[PDB]
Amino acid sequence: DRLLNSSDYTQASVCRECGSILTTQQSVPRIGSISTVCCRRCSMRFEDAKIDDSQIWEDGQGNKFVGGNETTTVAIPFVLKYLDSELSAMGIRLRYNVEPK
Amino acid sequence: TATTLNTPVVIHATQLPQHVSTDEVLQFLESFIDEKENTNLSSSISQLKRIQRDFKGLP
Amino acid sequence: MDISKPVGSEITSVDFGILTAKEIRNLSAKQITNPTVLDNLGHPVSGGLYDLALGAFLRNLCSTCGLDEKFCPGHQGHIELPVPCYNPLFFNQLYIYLRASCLFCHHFRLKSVEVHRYACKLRLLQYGLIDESYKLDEITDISSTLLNELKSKRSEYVDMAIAKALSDGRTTERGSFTATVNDERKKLVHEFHKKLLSRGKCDNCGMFSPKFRKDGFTKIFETALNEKQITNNRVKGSTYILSTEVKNILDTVFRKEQCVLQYVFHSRPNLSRKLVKADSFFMDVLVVPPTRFRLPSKLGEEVHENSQNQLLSKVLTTSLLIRDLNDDLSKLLEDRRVIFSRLMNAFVTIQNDVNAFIDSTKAQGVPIPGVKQALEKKEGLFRKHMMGKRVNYAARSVISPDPNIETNEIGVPPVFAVKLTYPEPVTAYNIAELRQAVINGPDKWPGATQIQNEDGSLVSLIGMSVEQRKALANQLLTPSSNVSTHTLNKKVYRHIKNRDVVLMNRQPTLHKASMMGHKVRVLPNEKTLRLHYANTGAYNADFDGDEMNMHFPQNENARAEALNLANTDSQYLTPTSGSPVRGLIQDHISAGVWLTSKDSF
Amino acid sequence: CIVRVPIALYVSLAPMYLENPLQGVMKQHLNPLVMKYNNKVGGVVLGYEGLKILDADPLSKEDTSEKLIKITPDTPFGFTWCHVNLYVWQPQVGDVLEGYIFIQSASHIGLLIHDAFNASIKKNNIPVDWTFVHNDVELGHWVDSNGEPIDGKLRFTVRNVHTTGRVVSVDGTLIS
Amino acid sequence: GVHVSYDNSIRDADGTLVQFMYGGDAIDITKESHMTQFEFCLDNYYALLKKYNPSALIEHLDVESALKYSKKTLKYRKKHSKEPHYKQSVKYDPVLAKYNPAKYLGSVSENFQDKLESFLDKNSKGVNEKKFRALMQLKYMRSLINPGEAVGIIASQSVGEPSTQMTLNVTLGIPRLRE
Amino acid sequence: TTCQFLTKAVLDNEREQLDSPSARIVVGKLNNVGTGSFDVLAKVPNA
Amino acid sequence: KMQYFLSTGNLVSQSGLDLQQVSGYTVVAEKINFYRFISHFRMVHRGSFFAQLKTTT
Amino acid sequence: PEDFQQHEQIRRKTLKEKAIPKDQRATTPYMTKYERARILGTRALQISMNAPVFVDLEGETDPLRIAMKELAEKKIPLVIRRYLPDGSFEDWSVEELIVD
Amino acid sequence: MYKTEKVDLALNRNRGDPITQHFGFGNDEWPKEWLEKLDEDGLPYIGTYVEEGDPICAYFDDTLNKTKIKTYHSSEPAYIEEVNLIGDESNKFQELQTVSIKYRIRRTPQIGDKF
DNA sequence: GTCAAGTACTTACGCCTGGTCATTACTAGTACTGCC
DNA sequence: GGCAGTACTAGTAAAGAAAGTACTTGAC
RNA sequence: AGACCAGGC
């Protein structure tokens, strides 16, 4: 309660096959569609992957490309998300493997 | 919408699907509506009754 | 944390690895290239350290996810370092394998049957086989007919030892790793590196390699191979070397000797079967952090860019200098004589910049702090923001003594009784007392300050009148008009009452009884916490200006612990000696001498 | 083309269904699942059948009524694995379906499938040798090569399936 | 991370084992105050019987087994233990390592068994002799340490806080603890 | 000496099972001592 | 540059003086009291080098 | 459907191997001070979220006081899963565990 | 307890550019609620009781054409004792841009105060 | 192989409250003015 | 009337008094 | 957010 729940509680979305806190991001949907959470590392460019019309998502750049929809939210402290940003600045890859896969 | 209160956390297919004929569907739809009336899926029951009456009759 | 917003998955483990450069070109949002942070009229220039592709910045939507400042998580980008440069975290371990390796056959300078002896001892230590790794020395100028046969007997002994222990209920295929097998693994790798570095000739093909000189960081020097032992190079049938050449050597060493370094660089068995590469010691691409985590130092008009932007600007300035230095090699003797002596000068300064970004003390140059020094000491990241944290829902004020308090209570002021609040979800048994709590409003004790709806929405009661506030009290227990929120109920942030729990705490908390759990009894007059005298022996708290903290827990799992488990009635006996710490102190002891006297009638 | 998938799904359980665990997994997770497209199933879930909650202790039997649900430490909700047989209507490309006519327009023939699911056959999917006559009064009809109005059924090959929006839509072509 | 496990065997957080039993007897310091205060507990027998309640707790316990082996090792050790420790062909574990003391009534330590029978021999004194030893053995069992006690924190605060009772030709005090 | 134990952890490719109370506060788990030394299960009545 | 020395206490010297410390030469005269105010003009200090030092003598 | 089925049968076989049977369990027959603090806590979160209450309310408005009342008549439908350091566990219901 | 803060209106510009912020009220529809604390020149009256949220000075702006007030950023109520007008010294004569306001706070000895 | 000493990096009580100051040289440019 | 000298201006570039281990280099 | 200074227990 003190060291997490009332200081920096956040429910951050985590890629299940990357184990990455700060890789995934919100997709930019079309009109009428709903946005989904999607990963950047285990994705693939659409020109590289030559599809099933639902795994294809798109950036805010208009960069439309198909890939990682294996993501979920886990409740972490927010300073862990800053710890990965400093370790990836060094070149350290923390992998957060979640239990329901 | 799109919460752990609504959606499953993880969803997987346990076994490969195989097709069912018209007899298994009409036995399902006579049992699925029976076990459901006896909730905002009433708008979906209205679409289930269209399919149940389609394999039995004609609108 | 909302108890009405559960979370599904859980981090069970973590593990450490190195970003390869292929990942951080796929992970990346946008490669950033020019060393100008933001141009005139305050706009972040496209391709700079502040870019809209790396996150929403200062009332300007992100170019990757299209969200504003409040909802963009921040996105990573990268830069392209033109030369493979040293990672200063791994330079001490690179320099061991930079040495101790033959520059001619690209093995290490040991004999290849003794390097194999550690590969089969460290494979046993990946599994829980600390005993069988000493039985492997029992398997025991010299022709290669039997050394090829000795490597078969040591390898078949391991393949028989691993398969038996994995069937004799002892080791999973993920490998058993305990504390005392971490002892004999660190002991064996330190035996391995100390014996690699002490070699004269390569014991595979017998000739010398020119020794290396570590000037400090940022540089590397090969020394002069003497005239006495260039004869051995002729019977086999000083210079600053480039960082591109060191990677060329060590990519060849790690392929001729891949089968040993799978077990030196892995504690647990490598189930992914990935190669270990010498590119993993270098870094060819810097990862720029998201622009959320490097916002500028804003103080009125005194806007200074972050210290990481000042270090990453110098890496990009040097990266465009060397791009404009290699534009003369396409133009092409004096024009070649001076342009290469300044190109090799630019090789050192881009290494000296990638040092200063990661570590401010490995950078020759009051200096700007690096990524290492935001983590290290008190005022680091682990000690200042992970092991200790600033907290919400917590108070601190001076203490005054108070009898007529039932010795398991703290006397809370009205001004903490109004600000501190607790989320009660509404039920059939709260709508008696929690309908009156919302009607009383944020300033009447006992009252409430906010209503959390079923939807996660949150309605403040501060700027409201009593007629609007009686309408929300009848709307308080209503069935949901949404299917996706049908099992939830409203939470009323009531004020702290006479039934809540409180953690009291005086620094230094030298033992666990200096942080106890008290009941609360509000008092109507002044602004000080009020403590009974039996608690003063445990907190070591006189009343000459002591102030002590007050933490208010926000769920029923922590209310049940601070009433039953960390309770102040449970802490009568300290666990140091078993002697009590709670008891009456100064006036109550001199009174009992007079009250229990024979004269007292 | 209605097909049967057996699934294994990891759901929540609010404390109000701690006396009726089968009734709660249906109302929270399975009743919002009917008549919607689902990515990890293949098509549109018509209904479900045979819900079984995986008990948390393995020492018990499947005959027992009292089962165990693991409570989250922070929140009072319980998480569990469940087995249930979904029945799902999935269309795929290549297959030919009966189509009841819903809208006859000059650009997009919007028709129904099994009186529920919307579909579309564009004008470029219609070959050139068919004509559309006007309806100036109130939406006419397309004239085929037989010189007759098309009406009722229309067997067409599935060209593309568009599932990203609110409901599913089926793109239809008329070449075979 | 050092804590009592449900084995009554205190150990580190990763799983490695520091001791096999807390202090050799698995009893809490905040409960062993009146454990050997026998003449206090005899005068207050009928009032301590209301909080330990012996006959109501016979059902969920094993009373028969641990008391037999506590007599097969007490009688064995009084016959021996004239010779020193290296000569002792021991042949019998202590009863506290063979039986779980939180479950078996009568699995006590040896100096609790030796001090009980020394009290129960010197002064012989309406409570009889067998009701008094059957209440100290349930008081010992209730004075067991609970599994989950963060012991290594308690053991580190039991040194660092009394070290601040020193402040605030042999070396002595806080420089001795530094060494 | 954080980034000396950091380099030794990444050159071992060391996986840690989040056992120490220090490792569970960094990643945000419930602590394995005292109250978090067990789970709590709920007996639901129906199948 | 003399207003900077008084406002901060930092000693900026190209040929550093015979002093061990480099900062903390000026102190705000409080006037929080007259006992406080007259005590600023009678105080001696050994140096800030000796403060960050774990000796007693 | 083939990788997950084999992964599910390994996830449910090891968790059966860790399950110590009811006749072969060896921990204490008492509900410890930590198990009492979490039984009263996890139940009081459920009472506050409209779980069915098995005891008559005598005008109690505090969810933690209701949880203390349900423990006195042993009406709490919760189970303690006591983990061993092997990863194995026992299962103790609240009606089995005797207090103090 | 006496507490003095300097209200400086000329710290966001340089080198003779025209002053965009003038003390006093403007011609816009600014609320008549703060005639009570403030005088016609955008300065507060002497002796007025000021709790948190009350304005301490009014100034008209030119790049926004709106009268903004600076407010009392302290949760302990005070009384305004004196208002100085710190005129700038220059060869060209300038409209006022710096005003020093002094507060007084009644510290009646409450309990918890050290004697 | 070897002990050997010099060198290099490493920590050094907890919490809390105020207050202040904070880039400098210079260098090229546009404008001001004295001039014939 | 317009030329060139200065005085400024805003502009963009450089900034000597604690105790422990681990390690290489070091004679022999 | 830092550095320095002045303090509280």
Ligand SMILES: Nc1nc2c(ncn2[C@@H]2O[C@H](COP(=O)(O)CP(=O)(O)OP(=O)(O)O)[C@@H](O)[C@H]2O)c(=O)[nH]1
């Ligand atoms: N952890 C720290 N605690 C401190 C420090 N300085 C003071 N203190 C606390 O402040 C208190 C200071 O007590 P005093 O210096 O007044 C000794 P005193 O004779 O006045 O005690 P009494 O006779 O009980 O009045 C003491 O309880 C300490 O716990 C410090 O530097 N660190």
Ligand SMILES: [Mg+2]
């Ligand atoms: Mg004091």
Ligand SMILES: [Zn+2]
């Ligand atoms: Zn991924």
Ligand SMILES: [Zn+2]
């Ligand atoms: Zn974004």
Ligand SMILES: [Zn+2]
């Ligand atoms: Zn060689």
